Amino acid sequence: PVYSERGLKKAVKSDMVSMFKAHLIEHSFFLDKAELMTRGKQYVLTMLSDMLAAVCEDTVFKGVSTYTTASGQQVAGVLETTDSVMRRLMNLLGQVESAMSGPAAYASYVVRGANLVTAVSYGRAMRNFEQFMARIVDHPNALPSVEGDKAALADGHDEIQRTRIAASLVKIGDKFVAIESLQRMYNETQFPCPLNR
Amino acid sequence: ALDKSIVVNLTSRLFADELAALQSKIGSVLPLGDCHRLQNIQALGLGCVCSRETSPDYIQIMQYLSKCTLAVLEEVRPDSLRLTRMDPSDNLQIKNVYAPFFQWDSNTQLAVLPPLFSRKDSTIVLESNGFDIVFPMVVPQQLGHAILQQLLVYHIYSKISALDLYTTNVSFMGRTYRLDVDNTDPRTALRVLDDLSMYLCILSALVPRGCLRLLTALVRHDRHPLTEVFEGVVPDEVTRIDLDQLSVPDDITRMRVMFSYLQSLSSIFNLGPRLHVYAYSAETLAASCWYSPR
Amino acid sequence: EALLGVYTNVVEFVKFLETALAAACVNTEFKDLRRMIDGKIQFKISMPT
Amino acid sequence: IAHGDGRRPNKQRQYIVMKACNKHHIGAEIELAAADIELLFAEKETPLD
Amino acid sequence: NRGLYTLVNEYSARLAGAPATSTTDLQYVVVNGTDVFLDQPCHMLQEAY
Amino acid sequence: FTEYAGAIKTITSALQFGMDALERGLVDTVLAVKLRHAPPVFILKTLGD
Amino acid sequence: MEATLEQRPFPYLATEANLLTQIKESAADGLFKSFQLLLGKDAREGSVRF
Amino acid sequence: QAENAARLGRQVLGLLPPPTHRVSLTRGPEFARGVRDLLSKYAASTRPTVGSLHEALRQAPFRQPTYGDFLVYSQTFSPQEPLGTFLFSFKQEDNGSSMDMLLTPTSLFMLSGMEAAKAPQTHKVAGVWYGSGSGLADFIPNLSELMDTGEFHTLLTPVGPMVQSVHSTFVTKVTSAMKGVGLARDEPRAHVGLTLPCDMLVDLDESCPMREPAGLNVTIYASLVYLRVNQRPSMALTFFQSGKGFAEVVAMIKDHFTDVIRTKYIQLRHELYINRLVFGAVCTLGTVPFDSHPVHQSLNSLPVLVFANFEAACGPWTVFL
C-alpha cells in the first residue's frame, strides 16, 4: 500500500508498470540465480517470506481452527512444487514436525426442516435456517458481535473427529507451511503435471 | 434548526501587528469556498483570484464573487478566526467599517463589490502566514451600479489608446473618487463588452420613429432638465431616419421587442448577491439584513 | 439457488491513550477551550560565570 | 478519520460484495466384457467353473 | 484497456490470443487447448527483450 | 419492529462511526504537531556540536 | 438463472478478519463484478416489500 | 371501531403547523423554556445513545411545498409515466371549467418538429408514446403562428415534478408539485425527485482541473430556442445545470447555441421581420443540492437521470439574445 494512497491515476499506473520489470528481470527464476551468487541461502529466504506476506489472508475462517499442527499451533498455507524443487527446499529448510492434525470427514448440509419448505415452492433457499431464524424471530436489535457469531459460523468445523495426517512441515517466521509435490499422483498415470509449465 | 459557525484553524500564531487590523474589523464580509466548520486559511480571503503577482480584472473577480458562499466574522482569537455564514434567507448582524465611508439608513439597498479604490487600504498582508487576505467591499446599489458603469466605459477608451479626469473618476453627489486601474486584464472585460454589440446594435435595429420624432420636437424648443446632454443641438442621425410617415401598429410591433431586450440587459449588469437591509442603527454602526444570492 | 455465507467486517477501537505514541505527550484532562485563549510557561535561566 | 484541515470531510461508507459459484464435472469410464457378465449367473457346480 | 484488477483476474484463467505449441517440429499455431499450459508476459507488459 | 430495529441498529453504528473517526484525530494531529517541530539530521547535527 | 445482487437487509454475520486493506481503490477499479457502493444516506436497510 | 379513530387523533394532532409562541406575563420568566429548535449544539457524552439524542432529533425544520391539482385528457398526457417527470402548463383560453392541458418534455419534442439526430435518443422513444406528432397539433391550430411572432415562451408556466397520477379512460388526475420536495404516494416517507432524459440535459459544470469553489446551490435552467428548419418554423429545447450565477450562464449559453444563431441570421440579409428577432428565453426551474450524484436509469432503451432532494422554484421567462 505504499504506492496506492492516491489511487490508480495516470502517473501511478506507469510507475507500477516500470516496477514489474525491475522485479521481473532481476528476480525471475530466483532459485536458479541462487547458485552463482555469493549469499544464496539467505537470498532464497527473502523470497519465500516475500511471497508469504504478499498473499491477502482474507480467510473468513481465520476464527475457525481447522488445520492445527501438534501442540496446537497454526498452519498458514501450502506451497506445492515439482520433485526437483522439493529436493532444494528440503535441504535449505527442515521437515521440523512432520505430523499435522486435521479433520477426516466432510460437513453435511441437509435440507431437513423449513429449508425444504422454501425449497419446494421457491427456486431459492437458505443455509442454517434455525440460526438464521433466531436472529429475527427472537433476538433482533443486538449488535453483530464476534463471540456470539464465531461458534455459529462453521456448520461442521467444531464437530469432525480429527486425526493425524502425515505430511511435511516447515517453519518460516512463525507461519508454518506444508510442502507437497504432485508428481507421484500424476507421473503414475502418464498424464502431464500442471506445475510443470 | 440550522446552525452556522466556521472556525478557522491556523498553523502559526499571529503577531501583534495584524491582530490590531483584524480586531478593528470585528464584523465584516469575506467569502470562502469550502462550506464546512473547519477551514484552511487559503480559502478565506478573496485573494485566490486577486493576488499581487497577477493582473486581476474586476470583471472576473466580480464574476467569481457571485459563486461563493459569504460569511461574517465573530472574533479574532490569536490563532483561530471564528466566522459565521450567510444562508440564502437568513437575518444577521452586519456592521460596516469600510474606509471610503458611506452613510446608510434603515430600508437601504446594498451590494457586494470587489476592492475598487485602494487595495493597499483594503487588503492586509499576512507575512506570518504567507497567504494574504483580500477583503470585498459593500456599497449601496446606487453607487453599487455606478462604479460598474465607468469600468465598462474605461476598458473601451483604454483600447483606443492603442486624459484621465473623464474616464476614471466615479462620481457621487458630494464626493468624486478614483478607480484602481493600472494593471488589469482587458480580456474578460472585453467579453462583457463583446455582448453589448449583441444587444446595442440590435437595439438600434427597431428604433421607433415617433420617439425619434419627439426629439425633433423636444430639444429644439420644448426642453427639460435631463435633456441637457445634447446641449440644444440635434445629432446628424435623427435628421436621416424620420422621413417615413408614422403609423401606430408599426411601432406596436417594434416596442414590444424593445420591451423584451431591455429585460435581457439585466443579464449583463448583474451585481453579486443583494442585501435588503431593514433596520440600521447609526451609532452602533450595526444593521440587520436578510441575504439572498441572486 | 440458496444463500451461502453472509458476512461482515468488525472494526475494533484503538484509542490514543492505549498507544505508546504518548511518550511524546503529557495528557492532562481539561474542561473548557471555549474559554481559554492561550497558554503560558515561564522560565529563568541563571548562568554562572 | 476526523482530521482538522480544510479537506472535504467524508461521510459514512459501505461496500457490497457478491461472489458466485462454478460447476464442474468429471467423467470416468469402465469396460466390462460380456463373457464376464454372463458367468456371474451360470449354475456351475463343477470345480473347473 | 479494461480494469487493472480484471487484468490480474483474467491473466490466470483465460488463455491468450493464438500462442505457440511445443513438442513439435516447427512453431505451429495452437489448435487444441486440452493440454497447453503456458503463459507469456509479452502481452500483459507489452515489451520485447 | 424489524423495520424499527432496522433504524436503531443503523443509527448507533452511525453514531459510533464518529468515535471511530474522532479518536484518530488524536493520533493524527499529535503526530501533525510533532511533524512541525522536527528539523532533519543534517541541520541538527551541525548545530549539535 | 444467474444470481444477481440485491440490497435487502439480510441479518449479516460477524467475521474476524479485516477486509479494508486496498478497497477504495479496488472495487472502483474492477476487482470483481457485482460491487455496490453506498454513500452516507444510502447506507441503510431498504424498504422491504413482497 | 373508535380504535381506528384513536389512530386519527394521533396523526392529525401530531401533524400540525407549530403554534405562534405566545405567553401571558403572569406566568413569569417561563417562556424561554418553550424555546427548543432555536438551539443547535446538543449534549455530547462518552458513549452517547439514541436515548441521549432522541431530543436532538425530535426537533425538525418545518418544510412543505404546495401542489397543483390538474384535470387532463387521456390524450395529451401519456398513461405510462416514470412518476418523476417534468411538466408545463399550456395557456391559451379558459374554455372548460376544469380542462387543463399539460406538456411533458418528451411530448414537447414531438410538438416541435426538429431533426432526428439533433436529439437522437428520445426520438425513438417519443414515437411510441404518441402518434406522428399530429394528434397533439390538432389541439392548437396556431403552432405555426405561435412560432412566428414569438409568443410561445410567454405561454408556459413550469410546475416541476410529479407526485401522483390516478388514470381513467379519458380523464387523468395529475397531482403535481411546486415549491419543494413532494412527499411520495405509493412509497410512504419517500420523496419524488426530478428526472430528466439524458439526451435533453447539457451540463455546464464539467471541466478538467486546469479551479472553482463549492456552495449550497446548483440551478437547473430551461432553454427554449426558436429555430427554423426546412424553411418551416420549429422550436428547440435544451436544459442546463450550473451553480454559477445568472451573470455567467447567459454568457455561456450563447457559446452553446452559436451555430443556431449562425445559421438563421445569414438569412436576414435579404429580409427583416421585427417579430422574428426574438431568439430565446431562460427560466429558473429551482435549486439542486451541491454534490448530489445524478443516478442514471433505463426505461423501455431510454437513459433517465434523477435528482434526489430537488426543490422547486419557478421564475419568469427572461428573454435573451
Name which of H317, H318, H28 is nearest H157 in CA terms: H317
Q: Which residue has the cell 414515437?
A: H127
Q: Shortest CB distance from G15 goes to which of C1, C3, C7?
A: C7
The values of phi and psi at residue H236, to 5°, are -155, 140
Please list, in sequence order, all residues whose beta carbon lies within 8 angstroms of the beta carbon of residue B293, skipping any fewer than 6 positions away: B66, B70, B88, B273, H217, H245
CB contact under 8 A, E4 and A13: yes
- Which chain A residues touch E if contact means CB-CB below 8 Å? 8, 13, 17, 20-21, 24, 192, 194, 196-197
Dist. CA C9–CA C5, nearest whole Å:
13
CB contact under 8 A, C10 and G19: no
Angle at B49 between CA B48 and CA B55, to 5 degrees: 130
Written as one letter, the residue type at C8 is T
Q: Sign of the C-alpha dihedral, residues H53, H58, H62, H67?
A: positive
Q: Sign of the C-alpha dihedral, residues H280, H285, H290, H293?
A: negative
The values of phi and psi at residue H150, to 5°, are 75, 65
Is H216's Cβ below 8 Å from some Cβ in F? no
Dist. CA B281–CA B286, nearest whole Å:
6
Experimental technique of record: cryo-EM
Q: Shortest CB distance from G34 goes to which of D12, D13, D18?
A: D18
User: Could you give the 3-state DSSP secondary structure of residue H172?
Assistant: strand
The values of phi and psi at residue E41, to 5°, are -80, 5
CB contact under 8 A, B9 and D5: yes
Is G32's Cβ below 8 Å from some Cβ in E? yes
B281 and B82 Cβ atoms separated by less than 8 Å:
no
H176 and H67 Cβ atoms separated by less than 8 Å:
yes
Find how far residue A41's CA is from the centre of its chain.
25
Is C8's Cβ below 8 Å from some Cβ in A? yes
Dist. CA B218–CA B222, nearest whole Å:
4
> Looking at chain G from residue 8 to 27, which residues have their Cβ under 8 Å from any Cβ of chain F?
9
**What DSSP state is assigned to residue H17?**
P
For residue H217, the chain B residues in CB contact (below 8 A) are 88, 293
Dist. CA B81–CA B44, nearest whole Å:
10
H161 and H200 Cβ atoms separated by less than 8 Å:
no
Dist. CA F12–CA H50, nearest whole Å:
7
Name which of E36, E16, E42, E15 is nearest E24 in CA terms: E36
Bridge partners of H283?
Answer: H222
Dist. CA A183–CA A186, nearest whole Å:
5
Is D23's Cβ below 8 Å from some Cβ in G? no
Q: Measured between alpha carbons, how far is residue D44 from residues D34, D35, D40, D41 in Å? A: 17, 15, 10, 9
Please list, in sequence order, all residues whose beta carbon lies within 8 angstroms of the beta carbon of residue H152, skipping any fewer than 6 positions away: H146, H224, H226, H235
Q: Which contiguous run of DSSP H or E holds residue A14?
A: helix A10-27
CB contact under 8 A, A197 and E47: no
Q: Which contiguous run of DSSP H or E holds residue C36?
A: none
Q: Which residue has the cell 467569502?
A: B31
Dist. CA B98–CA B106, nearest whole Å:
18
DSSP result, H180-192: S--B-SSSTT-B-
Q: Which residue has the cell 438551539?
A: H39
Is F9's Cβ below 8 Å from some Cβ in A? yes
Burial class of residue A163 in the structure, from the number of CB atoms within 10 Å of its CB (0-12 exposed, 13-18 middle, 19+ buried): exposed
Beta strands in chain H (DSSP E): 69-73, 162-167, 171-176, 217-229, 232-236, 239-242, 280-289, 311-312, 318-320
Is H42's Cβ below 8 Å from some Cβ in B? no
Q: Which residues of D15-46 are buried (b: 16+ CB within 10 A; e: fewer)?
A: beeeeeeeeeeeeeeeeeeeeeeeeeeeeeee
Q: What is the CA radius of gyration of chain A?
A: 23
Which grid coordinates are listed for A142?
Answer: 443486538
Dist. CA B27–CA B268, nearest whole Å:
31
Q: Which contiguous run of DSSP H or E holds residue A163?
A: strand A162-165
For residue D11, the chain G residues in CB contact (below 8 A) are 39-40
Name which of H170, H147, H174, H145 is nearest H162 in CA terms: H174
A49 and A172 Cβ atoms separated by less than 8 Å:
yes
**What DSSP state is assigned to residue H119?**
S
Dist. CA H36–CA H49, nearest whole Å:
20
- If DSSP states are collapsed to H, E and C, what string results for chain B? CCCCCEEECCCCCCCCCCHHHHCCCCCCECCECCCCCCCCHHHCCHHHCCCCCCCCCCCHHHHHHCCCECEEEEEECCCCEEEEECCCCCECCCECCCCCCCCCCCCEEEEEECCCCCHHHHEECCCCCCCCEECCEEEEHHHHHHHHHHHHHHHHHHHCCCCCCCCCCCEECCEECCCCCCCCCCCHHHHHHHHHHHHHHHHCCCCCHHHHHHCCCHHHHCCCCCCHHHCCCCCCCHHHHCCCCCCHHHHHHHHHHHHHHHHHHHHCCCCCCEEEEEEECCCCCEEEEEEECC
Please list, in sequence order, all residues whose beta carbon lies within 8 angstroms of the beta carbon of residue H287, skipping any fewer than 6 positions away: H217, H218, H219, H220, H310, H311, H313
Q: Which residue of C has its CA nearest to A145?
A: C10
Burial class of residue C24 in the structure, from the number of CB atoms within 10 Å of its CB (0-12 exposed, 13-18 middle, 19+ buried): exposed
User: Could you give the 3-state DSSP secondary structure of residue A168?
Assistant: strand
DSSP result, A16-82: HHHHHHHHHHHHTTHHHHTTSSSS-TTTTHHHHHHHHHHS----GGGGS--S-BGGG--EEEEEEE-
Question: Can you list the pairs that H121-127 forms with residues at least 24 positions away whose Cβ atoms lie under 8 Å?
Answer: H121/H197, H121/H198, H121/H199, H121/H302, H121/H303, H122/H197, H122/H199, H122/H200, H122/H302, H125/H299, H125/H302
CB contact under 8 A, A124 and C8: no
Q: Measured between alpha carbons, how far is residue E33 from residues A187, B27, E14, E21, H93 in Å? A: 21, 79, 11, 10, 77
Bridge partners of A171?
Answer: A176
Name which of B287, B292, B293, B273 is nearest B104 in CA terms: B287
Name which of B212, B232, B236, B211 is nearest B222 in CA terms: B232
Burial class of residue C45 in the structure, from the number of CB atoms within 10 Å of its CB (0-12 exposed, 13-18 middle, 19+ buried): exposed
Dist. CA H272–CA H295, nearest whole Å:
46
Burial class of residue F24 in the structure, from the number of CB atoms within 10 Å of its CB (0-12 exposed, 13-18 middle, 19+ buried): middle
Which grid coordinates are listed for B225?
Answer: 432638465
CB contact under 8 A, E45 and A20: yes
Name which of A69, A91, A73, A89 is nearest A81 in CA terms: A89
Give me the torsion for CA of B257, B259, B260, B261, rounded to 10°: 90
- Distance (Å) from the C-alpha of residue C13 to the closest C-alpha of chain F? 7
Q: Which residues of A44-58 are buried (b: 16+ CB within 10 A; e: fewer)?
A: beeebeeebeeeeee
Bridge partners of B137?
Answer: B113
Dist. CA A183–CA H204, nearest whole Å:
66
β-strands B133-134, D13-17: how paired? Answer: unpaired
A101 and A162 Cβ atoms separated by less than 8 Å:
yes
Is B52's Cβ below 8 Å from some Cβ in C? no
B78 and B32 Cβ atoms separated by less than 8 Å:
no
